[model samples]
Target: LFKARDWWSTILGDKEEFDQGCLCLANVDNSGNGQDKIIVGSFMGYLRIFSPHPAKTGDGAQAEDLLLEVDLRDPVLQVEVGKFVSGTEMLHLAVLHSRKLCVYSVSGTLGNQCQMKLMYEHNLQRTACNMTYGSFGGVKGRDLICIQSMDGMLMVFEQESYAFGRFLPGFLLPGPLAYSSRTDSFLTVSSCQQVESYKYQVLAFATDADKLVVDWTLNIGEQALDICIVSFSASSVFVLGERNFFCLKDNGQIRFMKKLDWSPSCFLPYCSVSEGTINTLIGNHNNMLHIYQDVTLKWATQLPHIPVAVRVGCLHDLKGVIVTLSDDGHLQCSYLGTDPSLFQAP
Candidate 1:
């Protein structure tokens, strides 16, 4: 069902000097310095940082500069950064390549380049695809990272110590994953449409005929290779996928907020006092970013190129946005809502 509707377009900047392309993006603590946040765009092995745009006064468009660009020894394959439970915006940033995970701390000034403090070097590494920090940080325990590898292994590493926490031995193929912050649980959907859950410590949990707690293919549409999870309320969970996104409550009621016809690249929902919207930055074949409100498709705008991946968070008490690396080397922000239709109803 290809909706032939047109998407809005906005070309931010065509600075001819740089175009390496984006690999992964995340929202971090931006101290209002304009250049506070960073975007990791990889080309070969280079990570280009797009300086925050200077604060504007009137209506003129302000452009950002390429603040700093650094190269890593290996091509950064996967990266994730977020605040810890200690109320410190300063976070553990991990970059994983073929068989290694590099952890660093974003501290001091931007010039420090977020010192690489520790590297959780592992060799028996079963091809890891993505990594994520638990929801509540050190809440359930310490900040732990669960890696969904290519060889079907859900490996967990505890916080600062980086000790092997749990090595679950069941996985066919792991894609986008989310770990509950308040609980010792994580969710990983396979490439074949099979979804499973892992409870860190479930005493009363029983192994069925398959030896896993929950295993089933709820939908048979697209093999969902991407998923986004958000803790809606204290006991509610929301999951996003290719053509559909559903909400689940503690009472086991599963209802969908919306359904999509396009393959979504990134889907995340955030709620705050001033502003809250289910922010979905989708990368279509035409290179457009679509923003949806509630359950309706609100706006769609064009990008310079396809957005490889997107990371969303609240960095400066506002809606934070980060774009990932594409086939080429370019990283852009999603804050620039250019479509006038976005300001109005479609």
Candidate 2:
């Protein structure tokens, strides 16, 4: 898509390529400020946070713009923010590497000398691939974490405490993992070329790990790129397959599907523009970001680089700003502008 949008960009990796789920946008300062900061991690064991100041102050990672820059000393696989500490009801950062998982708290004022404090960490016996957090088993407040290991293990944690670990039935490799709070189930795309749903209660009460049951399964016939639950209106699972993106019900029925013309790297499904109608922003390998409104292609904007992950953020007193990150470590914050492109005729 050709649009003369004045976008801001930055590179997070001059050294290493980032993985799929390396960035998270949230308010981590715990300073009662509603402003969101950009939190990104890399496989090189470096973690950085940025308070993007675009309007009135400066542009694109200006002087002192990057608040906290430090190496975690371990390769980061996935990063998320939630209630990780046991006693307090505040949120903390959780980082997952191949060998361990750690929780950190970013304290102090925003855009100031914010310090990263380690609350707790758990070293793993099995190699980790990814993680998902939610109040599993319908528990209230202080969500639990479920980590997926490389050799097919689901390790459950109850906020700094280990609950249990179970092997996924016949699991060969790990794909994408997400939890649906509405259904109280953990969903993942299996190497068996299907989306499998495993209930929390079923795994909790099981005495034998090998006897674990898959609650349901949907064969999408392709390796999934990523899977997430979009719950703004209807709680449905959205799977980004190798060829298509689909929406599914809790019981394994396909609600709808969108066929893609380009290969996608990652996607983010946030709030819909209107009531009960969902929209998604998809990033493709062509350096083009495609926007879809309920299975209909709305717009596509060519970006500077192929995005590995994307999130909609509110920055510089502006809401709905598109934040994109690349495997090449490029980070961009932009909005869709109406200035007609000079490359194409009107």
Q: Choose the strongest candidate by lDDT.
A: 2
- TM-scores for all candidates: the values are 0.69, 0.93
Model 1: weakest 10-residue lDDT segment is 1-10
Candidate 1, superposed: residue stretches over 4 Å from native: 1-36, 41-43, 54-68, 83-89, 110-124, 135-141, 160-170, 203-212, 215-221, 232-240, 250-253, 270-279, 312-325, 334-346
For 1-346, candidate 1 gives per-residue lDDT tens digits of 2222222222222331222123334433334443235556342455444444434558875443444455666656666665432334455566666576666554434443443445345543566666767743335334656665676555566544443434434445555676654455666665665444556554123322212344323442445545555544454345556667665443324544567677665544543222333444555545666665556666666666766555454333345444433444444444534446566545
Error of 2 at 28 (Å): 1.3
Instruction: Give lDDT tens digits, candidate 2, residues 165-275.
Output: 989986888989999998899999988898999999998877599338999999999999998897874798999998999989988899899888888899877668888
For each candidate in the order shown, give its overall lDDT on alpha carbons.
0.50, 0.84
Specify the highest-TM-score model's number.
2
By summed lDDT, which 10 consecutive residues of candidate 2 come out lowest?
54-63
